[PDB]
Design a protein around this ligand. Structure first.
Ligand SMILES: [Zn+2]
Ligand SMILES: [Zn+2]
Lengths: 47, 248, 51, 107, 209, 186
RNA sequence: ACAGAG
DNA sequence: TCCAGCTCCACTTAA
DNA sequence: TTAAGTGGAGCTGGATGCTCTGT
């Protein structure tokens, strides 16, 4: 998550504005790329 | 004089907690964590407000996270500490971050629906009186505060005037507001026409629009309803109810 | 060829910055309870960090 | 404030241990005991304005004076001109007249 | 505070005095002109003053009709008045054999008690007024023309002059605040005296429906 | 909760608020000088701006290439590992490399002196790399960790890995297109 | 379906 | 492109 | 403990100026 906040911005108010999206992702148990692909794959409208 | 006007201005205009606090800090200690709010009492002196630590303690515990009154203390006359507990519903105990950005938006004084209020002074040379143009949507609250002459205050929204002062005051409001809008663009209608319009809107005890929704409650003829809007649905409804129709 | 490096660094345990209560649980989660034939961590704790 | 784990770089959370409150990672054993006072001050914006308005000088800082209205002919005036309707090939004006506080507003 | 809180208990009491004087209940002249500094006399500030049961009005009898036609005015203390407090006032009203009562709630009423005030009895009719509506007399407001509740012998002469029925008149609802001020039920006709731009006056009529 | 809260005209003393605020959080439980309670000074948590890592403690301008080479030469005798970028082609012929006029890089040249570096008056720094002089500019300043390693595959399956040092600064070289173009205008 | 005109 | 009705879902009172 | 009546949020279905003059 440190690299995400590095890419978004390292100002104070920018981090304060972005914080509730990290706090949302930590509520679910997504911490690994396989977990994130498993979460996104079950939202896909199956064609 | 304007010294009296700013008091009742500050009694109705919505003031946020963050607007009077000079810093809002989180303090982590080895035994407890909490959030500290220091009030800027010089600005309370200059804005002429009826707020201190005990009033902010009572404005908090109103629809914020269900904090308890035991959690909030009033250690000085300016400092207020808010110790948080477990939200326990789709949130982590690190909900200190929620009150870090949500507690500055609580209301401590005034009416929650008033966006802003302003002091407006007159033009005459024989007098100088100070009225109060309020940009909000709560007539009942602005009428009822101490120091506002509630018998002579009005609105532009006819729905609030109908809800508070009755159907007849709403009729008068429709007349005054249509005539005011026609005067401001240089037009000129005889007042009997807007009088007939206001009496047509308010003869069933309720202000009814000139939409298809207000017209569905006034007129009884089925083909008059079906000749204007929603042409299909009125026909099937008159078939369903077996509704007969005069050609009057 | 196709240059890709993997490292493994050994973090200590005797320092105060290692919550052993969480380390025992994460080592029980990753490894088996008593298998230790092939194992990510050697001891009963999270010992390594892979890069 | 955001603080991140030296090990894995996830976001730390504050929790309570057996001797201190700790910053702790959710995904690795790293914890940091809060031994001393640590703080973060927001310093928000105060409500700077008081905003009294509507003075007569704030009304008559517009050009026109000593002209003639068709109603009461008074000199102290407040004029306006529009053109933004090209169905109106003639010009468009509106006038305010307040020397005797008569208050006309016509075309 | 305590300069503005006793202000509310003065102003609400004054407006209830006028509301009882306009419904034909006997109000003495001094209660309609009870000065704030004179209201300080019989009750001081909140440590000496007592809110809920010291400011009740049960003196009010219909001096037009009958001395046993009496009406309460209660000031409950809690902001959201539950069913239990309504039952307390109803059994007190049962004891004194009074039929009409008012309740001045401070912030609101719980939705199971607003349902209660309709269906407890047709003989026990109770009216909820918020304390924020009583901070001004809405009849004194300049947008509200003077309403007059009409007698049956005047409704009959109205409907005979224009040759009408009752259901062809214009309507006013019973949830109208000026209708609840006078306490009027379905089937009464009010007379509205509208002021004009001239010195003239235009009279009009509304049926409660 | 009693709503009718009372207030007074008296003016708050400045120090009285200061000392109340002081007394509200200056209490410390740092008396536990114990192992668990102790904390490792070289593993503090990372505050997010990497130049500004220190949030807890025991208690910027942008430099240029002439100030870069002056501090490494005059101020200190200690050597420093740089990381410089080149232009895409270096101004040479591939020496018997079986070509086409393709790109000439450092992988095609030989050992020996390849050029000279001229630090001019008033901050101008050039890289004279033959008959043409390139232009040297400081690149984006990195503040994360960079290590310069030697990976040697002495055997088919095993070998040596050795760290040579940390790289701090990044230089950028670019051809001076105005001087290249002012020889023969077009 | 597009362009005009008042 | 903008706006009333209809239906789903948490949130207190009350037993 | 839970039955229930009522707030707030999302979905749905409706509507958007008058004529002639030609291809
Ligand atoms: Zn970590
Ligand atoms: Zn004029």
């Amino acid at each position: 998550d440190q690299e995400i906040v590095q890419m978004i911005g390292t100002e104070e108010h920018v981090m304060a504005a972005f914080g509730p999206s990290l706090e949302e992702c930590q509520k679910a148990q997504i911490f690994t790329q396989m977990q994130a692909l498993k979460y996104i794959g079950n939202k896909v409208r199956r064609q | 004089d304007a010294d009296y006007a700013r008091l009742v201005k500050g009694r109705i205009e919505k003031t946020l907690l963050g607007e009077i606090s000079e810093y809002i800090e989180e303090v982590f200690l080895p035994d407890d964590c909490f959030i500290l709010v220091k009030l800027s009492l010089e600005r309370i002196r200059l804005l002429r407000l009826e707020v201190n630590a005990e009033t902010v303690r009572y404005s908090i515990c109103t629809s914020k996270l269900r904090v308890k009154p035991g959690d909030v203390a009033v250690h000085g006359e300016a400092v207020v500490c808010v110790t948080p507990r477990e939200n326990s519903k789709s949130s982590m105990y690190y909900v200190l971050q929620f009150l870090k950005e949500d507690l500055p938006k609580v209301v401590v004084q005034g009416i929650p629906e008033v966006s802003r209020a302003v002091i407006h002074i007159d033009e005459q040379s024989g007098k100088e009186k100070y009225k109060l143009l309020v940009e909000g949507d709560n007539l009942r609250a602005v009428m009822a505060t101490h120091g506002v002459k509630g018998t002579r205050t009005t609105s532009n929204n006819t729905y609030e005037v109908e809800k508070t002062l009755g159907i007849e005051a709403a009729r008068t409001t429709i007349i005054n507001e249509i005539q005011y809008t026609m005067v401001n663009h240089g037009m000129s209608i005889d007042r009997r026409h807007v009088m007939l319009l206001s009496d047509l809107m308010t003869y069933k005890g309720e202000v009814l629009g000139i939409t298809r929704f207000g017209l569905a409650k006034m007129k009884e003829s089925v083909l008059m309803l079906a000749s204007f809007e929603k042409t299909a649905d009125h026909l099937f409804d008159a078939a369903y109810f077996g509704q007969k129709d005069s050609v009057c | 060829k196709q240059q890709k490096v993997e490292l493994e660094m050994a973090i200590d345990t005797l320092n105060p910055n290692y919550c052993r209560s969480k380390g025992e649980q994460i080592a029980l989660n990753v490894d088996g309870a008593c298998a230790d034939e092939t194992s990510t961590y050697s001891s009963k704790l999270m010992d390594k960090q892979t890069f | 404030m955001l603080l991140f784990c030296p090990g894995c770089g996830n976001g730390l959370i504050v929790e309570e241990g057996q001797r201190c409150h700790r910053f702790s990672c959710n995904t690795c054993p790293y914890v940091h005991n809060i031994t001393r006072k640590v703080t973060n001050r927001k310093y928000p914006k105060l409500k700077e304005v008081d905003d009294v308005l509507g003075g007569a000088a704030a009304w008559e800082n517009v050009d026109s004076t000593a002209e003639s209205c068709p109603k009461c002919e008074h000199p102290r005036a407040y004029f306006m001109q529009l053109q933004t309707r090209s169905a109106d090939e003639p010009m468009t004006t509106f006038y305010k007249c307040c020397n005797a506080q008569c208050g006309h507003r016509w075309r | 505070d305590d300069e503005e809180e006793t202000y509310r208990l003065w102003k609400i009491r004054k407006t209830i005095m006028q509301l009882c004087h306009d419904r034909g209940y006997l109000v003495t002249q001094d209660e309609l002109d009870q000065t704030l500094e004179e209201f300080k006399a019989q009750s001081g500030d909140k440590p000496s003053e007592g809110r809920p049961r010291r400011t009740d009005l049960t003196v009010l009898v219909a001096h037009n009709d009958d001395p046993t036609d009496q009406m309460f005015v209660f000031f409950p203390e809690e902001p959201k008045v539950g069913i239990k407090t309504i039952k307390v006032y109803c059994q007190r009203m049962q004891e004194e054999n009074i039929t009409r009562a008012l309740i001045v709630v401070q912030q609101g009423m719980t939705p199971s008690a607003k349902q209660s005030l309709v269906d407890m009895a047709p003989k026990y009719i109770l009216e909820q007024f918020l304390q924020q509506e009583l901070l001004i007399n809405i009849t004194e407001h300049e947008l509200v023309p003077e309403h007059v509740v009409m007698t049956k012998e005047e409704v009959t002469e109205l409907l005979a002059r224009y040759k009408l029925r009752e259901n062809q008149l214009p309507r006013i609802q019973a949830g109208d605040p000026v209708a609840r001020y006078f306490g009027i039920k379905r089937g009464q006709v009010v007379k509205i005296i509208r002021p004009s731009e001239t010195a003239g006056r235009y009279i009009t009529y509304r049926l409660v429906q | 909760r009693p709503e009718v809260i009372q207030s007074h005209s008296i003016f708050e003393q400045g120090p009285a608020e200061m000392m109340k605020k002081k007394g509200n959080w200056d209490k410390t439980v740092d008396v536990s000088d114990m192992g668990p309670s102790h904390i490792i000074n070289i593993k503090k948590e990372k505050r997010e701006t990497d130049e500004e890592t220190k949030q807890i403690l025991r208690m910027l301008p942008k430099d240029v290439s002439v100030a870069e080479l002056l501090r490494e030469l005059s101020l200190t005798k200690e050597e420093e590992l740089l990381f410089l970028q080149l232009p895409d082609t270096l101004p040479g012929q591939p020496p018997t490399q079986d070509i086409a006029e393709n790109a000439c890089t450092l992988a095609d040249l030989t050992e020996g002196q390849v050029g000279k570096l001229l630090i001019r008056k008033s901050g101008r720094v050039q890289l004279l790399l033959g008959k043409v002089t390139l232009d040297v500019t400081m690149g984006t300043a990195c503040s994360f960790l960079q290590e310069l390693v030697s990976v040697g595959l002495g055997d088919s399956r095993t070998g040596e890995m050795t760290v040579l040092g940390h790289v701090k600064h990044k230089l950028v070289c670019s051809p001076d297109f105005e001087s290249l173009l002012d020889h023969k205008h077009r």
